[PDB]
C-alpha cells in the first residue's frame, strides 16, 4: 500500500 499501483489494502 506504499506503491502508487497498490490495490491491496493494509493498515
Amino acid at each position, epitope marked *: *500500500c*506504499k506503491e*502508487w*499501483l*497498490s490495490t491491496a*489494502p*493494509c*493498515g
Partner: antibody
Amino acid sequence: QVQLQESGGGLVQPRGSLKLSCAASGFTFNTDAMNWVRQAPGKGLEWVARIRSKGFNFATYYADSVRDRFTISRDDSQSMLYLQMNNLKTEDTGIYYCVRGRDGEAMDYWGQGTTLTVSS
Amino acid sequence: DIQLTQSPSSLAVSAGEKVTMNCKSSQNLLHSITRKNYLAWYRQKPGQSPKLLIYWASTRGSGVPDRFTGSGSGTDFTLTISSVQAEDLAVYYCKQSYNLYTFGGGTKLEIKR
C-alpha cells in the same frame, strides 16, 4: 447519484493562498481515493494531487510542479475533499476539478470545477 | 515523467463515418505481472467536465456504448469511434496511470458538414 460539488475558487494575488473544497455525494466516500485535476486557460488537463483511502493510511501523491506547495486532505465523516494551496503562482490559474478515482481502475466522476485566477 | 503524445491534433470526419486517433507513450505502460496496459481515454465536450470512456486500454467504462473501441499495447494505443455522430465533437485525451498520472495534448474532433 454521485455528486461532487467544488467551491472556493476565485481571484488571488501571486504568492497568496487559497483553499478549495469538494462535497461528495452518492457513493461511499470512505472507500474511494480522491483526486484534484486542473485545466489551465485553453489548455489540456494536468493531474494535481491524490489522496488514497484510510485503508491505505491516507497516502498522498503530488505532481512535481505542485509538490510542497499544495496540501490535499479529506474528511471521511463529512465527505469533504480539500486542496489547500500556498505560494500560489500565475501558472496555477485554471479550473480545478474534483475527481473520484478508484485505485486500480480509472478516474470515475469529475466535478463541475471551480475557477481560480492568480493575478494582482 | 512519462510523456504521452497524441495525433492528429485535430480531425474532421463526416457523420456516420468511423475515426481513428492515436496516443503514444514515452514509456511502456504494460505491467509485467497483470499484463494490463495502464492507459485510459477521456473526452471533454465543449463546456463540460471530462468523461471516462475507456481504461486498461480496452475495457469500456460503465454505460459507455460499444462504438468506442480502445486498443494497442506497450507504447502505442488507439481509440476508434464508429458511427461518429454530431454529439461526439469534443477533445479526446489519453491518460496514463502506470506511475502517477499524465494526460496527452488531446485530439480535437470536428464534424464535416
